[PDB]
């Protein structure tokens, strides 16, 4: 298919086929997840269903839930493609499309979160929270269903990422290992950060409170950010100050 | 039931019933875990048994272990109620009782740890350690069975919490995301912190060594605390100093 | 057996036997994993196979994979014994050999990583990466298969350890809780630290970029190390400076 998503999906299939041919231990799994399907949405739903199933939640039920969401919500499909593109372009480990789809926990947790956010918006909050708990369980990514996130989002070593209930993340944001977008321990209300488009947040950075991180800004590794960071400026240190 | 625990349990049931009625995907799980029971202890034991089971440990075996502990140890029941109350009162996300019981990993890990501590005290240390490993596995909470913890304990994004073997935590303590109560790497002996009643420890704080954190004190996010913090004082920074 | 590995294995069996006799809930698991075998390699492969299996990867398949690797690669066996010795000697919690073998997530993740590294070297990279993902899943240890690590390695609260693709770790290194040996977010190339023999890296330390941490050096807890640390010097702070 000559369209963008079509081309990306075509690349995923070609890559999976080479991997299946070279590694017989993974061949059937690559066939059932990717090669037996004709869309990115169905393969992602299939994979997420298996990854997140539990004694509470059948893989076939989760498969249905994810597939229904992607089929009904064009913006979810656009976001998945944008996030695949972001990994292919910005991942320092230079991940391939199929490997991102199958193995990248940040990417997978993010797509699953978008469905949890939709459920949350559709007044299915118990289920949204159940899905959220599994995402945390399995992908070591804790994003509250009520968090708002854009697309073109890059994770890096997603383990231990925390994004609170009232946080907002723009487009084309990079969130590295052990980033916390959380609060001070204050109860209730808007208490989590607002991250502008194109922001890079370094490993181990904690950004606490309802503060603004300006578009294109960078936060240095290990920073504790408690104040607003202007657009296209760099904030670093504990406590963080502008450079 | 007009007593405190009875009232809390009554609230849990009412909430679970509304959730079951509104979300058919979760209705049977809410019935088996909560609505089919007549006590908090049995429902918590049932839930913990399922959460922590493995190919080594049957859910029915763990269910028995937890239920036996709660039925035989009044202080465990008091602590569970106190921790539910602490979440209901101090959780910034304003969690309901049933949602705390079912979904809050800090709360669940803590109750399970109290049983591991009891086993440890009852000279069943291999089993205590086996239970401890599962708690870490499943709830991302690493509390050594020999650690002593009070009640009214609040977690927040429990993932990656570490509490060492010789640590002591008082009552009504709040431990936020990625807190480490550990050691310097020195081998053996008393080497982990003593946390006073009512202490608040901010996200990412590391408190190392056998030092005293005074009652009512606060530790700022991202702090590295290597010295004693007096009661009702605030310590912040890397290295931490009193404000 | 009077040889070093033979003696260590003998100790593991004796310890497991005492644990099986004292704890009937664990007796069968200790029998199947340890007491029914006549080598450390077979018991470790058996255990790793069970720990890491998934719907994608049968425990019997993983058991074969690990056993084949250990039987064919003398250096893997030497490394496993060296790491057991390192825990027995340097673990602040004073772990026994059998408890290290069975319960220590750092130790287990490390041995499994050595097999992933071998697969990576043997041009089975899809499988190496699949194994790597499970190791991260189960042991909360994220070591890229292409990372090079020596032996006599000590972990401490391995949860959240991250070691990047181009990192190099020498012999007799101690890596404490929440250590990150990663990059700045820069894409491609050599971008991860080189850790000398005998280095101690404190809890929560982040070491970023292709920099040198000298032999015998120490990195203080919570440090952000962005520059070279000379041999047998101590680096501490955010940003880190030499003391």
């Amino acid at each position: 298919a000559p369209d963008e998503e079509g081309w990306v999906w075509g690349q995923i299939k070609a890559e999976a086929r080479r991997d299946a041919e070279s590694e017989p231990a993974l061949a059937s799994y690559l066939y059932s997840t990717i090669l037996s399907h004709s869309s990115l949405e169905r393969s992602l739903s299939f994979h997420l269903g298996n990854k997140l199933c539990s004694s509470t939640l059948l893989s076939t039920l989760l498969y249905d839930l994810f597939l229904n969401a992607f089929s009904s919500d064009p913006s979810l499909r656009s976001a998945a493609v944008a996030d695949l593109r972001a990994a292919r372009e910005r991942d320092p480990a230079c991940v391939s499309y199929s490997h991102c789809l199958l193995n990248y926990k940040g990417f997978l947790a993010c797509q699953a979160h978008r469905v949890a956010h939709l459920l949350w918006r559709q007044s299915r909050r118990p289920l949204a929270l159940a899905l959220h708990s599994r995402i945390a369980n399995v992908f070591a990514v804790d994003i509250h269903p009520a968090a708002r996130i854009g697309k073109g989002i890059l994770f890096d070593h997603a383990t231990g990422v925390v994004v609170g209930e009232t946080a907002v993340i723009g487009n084309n944001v990079s969130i590295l290992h052990h980033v916390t977008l959380g609060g001070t321990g204050k109860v209730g209300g808007d208490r989590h950060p607002k991250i502008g488009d194109g922001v890079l947040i370094g490993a181990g950075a904690t950004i606490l409170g309802n503060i603004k991180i300006g578009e294109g800004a960078k936060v240095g590794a290990g920073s504790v950010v408690l104040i607003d960071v202007p657009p296209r400026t760099t904030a670093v240190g504990n406590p963080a100050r502008l450079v």
Side-chain angles (χ1 to χ4, degrees), chain A:
Chain A
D3 66 287
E4 179 62 15
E5 179 178 332
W7 183 82
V8 173
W9 168 240
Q11 295 292 288
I12 290 169
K13 291 202 86 171
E15 294 163 0
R17 203 169 284 122
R18 289 196 298 274
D19 280 356
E21 292 169 347
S22 76
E23 183 46 71
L26 294 173
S28 294
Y29 151 80
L30 293 167
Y31 169 79
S32 66
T33 308
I34 293 176
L35 299 178
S36 68
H37 297 127
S38 296
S39 72
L40 169 61
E41 291 77 19
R42 186 164 210 110
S43 301
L44 175 56
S45 301
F46 184 107
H47 192 46
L48 284 174
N50 278 282
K51 284 279 193 180
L52 294 167
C53 70
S54 64
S55 68
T56 304
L57 303 166
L58 293 175
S59 59
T60 51
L61 170 65
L62 292 179
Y63 182 25
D64 284 347
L65 185 82
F66 290 123
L67 191 42
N68 289 344
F70 283 116
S71 305
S72 77
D73 194 337
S75 65
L76 289 189
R77 307 191 295 263
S78 295
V81 171
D83 287 353
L84 281 167
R85 195 169 343 106
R88 191 59 175 91
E89 296 172 358
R90 313 208 303 274
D91 177 47
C94 306
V95 70
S96 77
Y97 286 123
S98 63
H99 291 166
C100 184
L101 170 59
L102 294 168
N103 300 330
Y104 267 39
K105 291 170 164 86
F107 170 80
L108 288 169
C110 193
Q111 309 325 304
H113 161 79
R114 296 181 197 283
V115 174
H117 183 70
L118 181 60
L119 289 168
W120 183 268
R121 286 182 54 233
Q122 294 171 333
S123 309
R124 294 182 81 179
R125 301 190 168 181
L127 183 58
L129 291 168
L131 175 51
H132 160 253
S133 179
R134 287 303 287 146
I135 295 166
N137 286 162
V138 173
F139 294 132
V141 170
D142 175 8
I143 306 173
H144 191 283
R148 300 165 205 99
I149 73 185
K151 61 192 185 191
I153 308 301
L154 179 77
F155 295 87
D156 174 65
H157 310 103
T159 306
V161 166
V162 169
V163 178
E165 175 170 22
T166 63
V168 173
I169 304 173
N171 302 310
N172 307 307
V173 173
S174 295
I175 305 147
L176 303 197
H177 181 47
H178 275 172
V179 162
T180 301
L181 306 177
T184 64
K186 148 170 178 304
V187 177
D190 201 337
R191 66 204 185 264
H192 304 129
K194 313 300 185 276
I195 309 308
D197 291 347
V199 164
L200 165 63
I201 312 179
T206 78
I207 308 180
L208 297 182
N210 186 28
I211 56 187
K212 283 178 299 203
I213 307 297
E215 167 178 11
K218 306 174 187 174
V219 177
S223 304
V224 180
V225 185
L226 310 178
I227 69 195
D228 288 351
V229 180
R232 278 268 196 188
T233 70
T234 296
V236 70
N238 181 10
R241 298 179 68 247
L242 309 177
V243 177

